[PDB]
Amino acid sequence: MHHHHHHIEGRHMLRPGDCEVCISYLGRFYQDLKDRDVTFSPATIEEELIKFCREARGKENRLCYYIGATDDAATKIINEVSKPLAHHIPVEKICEKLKKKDSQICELKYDKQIDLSTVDLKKLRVKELKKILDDWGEMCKGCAEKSDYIRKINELMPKYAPKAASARTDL
Template identity: 30%
Template sequence: MFRQLLIAAFLMLLVIRQTSAAEECEVCVKVMEDIRATMSKEDSRKKPEIEKAMGAYCGREDLSAREKKICYYIDPIKRDVAQPYSLGMPSLKVCQRITKQNPEICTVKFPVKTEKMEQKDLSKLRVKQLKQILSQRGVECTGCVEKDEFVKKVQETEHLATDEF
């Protein structure tokens, strides 16, 4: 009985750790998944084809600023990215591996979605998330102590919300 409980707890810890790692490199994982989706099964095993697919993906005009930033980071190390990619390594593992060469890759994150949020929706967020929203907008809430003050400041700076850095 104790052994089964211990195994279940270990598996839960493993799942929680894996999801937090995916959130850590969320933009990189999305870019890698999008590149993989554009390729055929045979081409995903060939390094030159992977490099071409990366170039084609990064050359698109409809990429967000964060995706362009990841492309900027992986452009000089395309061959290092193509190697594990050609072996069928999952996108998260590829991102973790290339983070060893360029630690900034996993620091690029998607913004917290706030558009058209009501007062009650913002009040459900944690203070840390509210501070993160404000920092993404380039605003500092000096003198804010209570959660309600942060919510009010986020609503006041709604016009500053963009996808740019």
């Protein structure tokens, strides 16, 4: 009879950065471009960022999806982060400027989240998979892990989440 609990720091007195979703990865990316590692061009920068997007993991992936750098995200052009980035705009338009049109880009508090689980776009972790999976109904006696859902749920991706078919076509 014993549990585990421990928490402290992480956001005391409001940590530096202002934006929670912004200045996270994009801030560490541009730092390399200016570090005599990449040219400030829409072609020399998009050639590197593309790799980070397709090879992203976690919050690093949700970014490229919001900025639209890959065709498998939600757009067909990466200029959104190249055109301006080359016009002397270091992670300044990613949200700071874009806010002029979409302020939810940074905060994303009341953003358009999926009404299925508790944390789908907010806490994208073992929880987002442990909560969304339970909604579909699945079990095998003593079995529940993040890496486990990567295949247990993936095999039912188009089943319990077709997209562009369940809420787009057919009807």
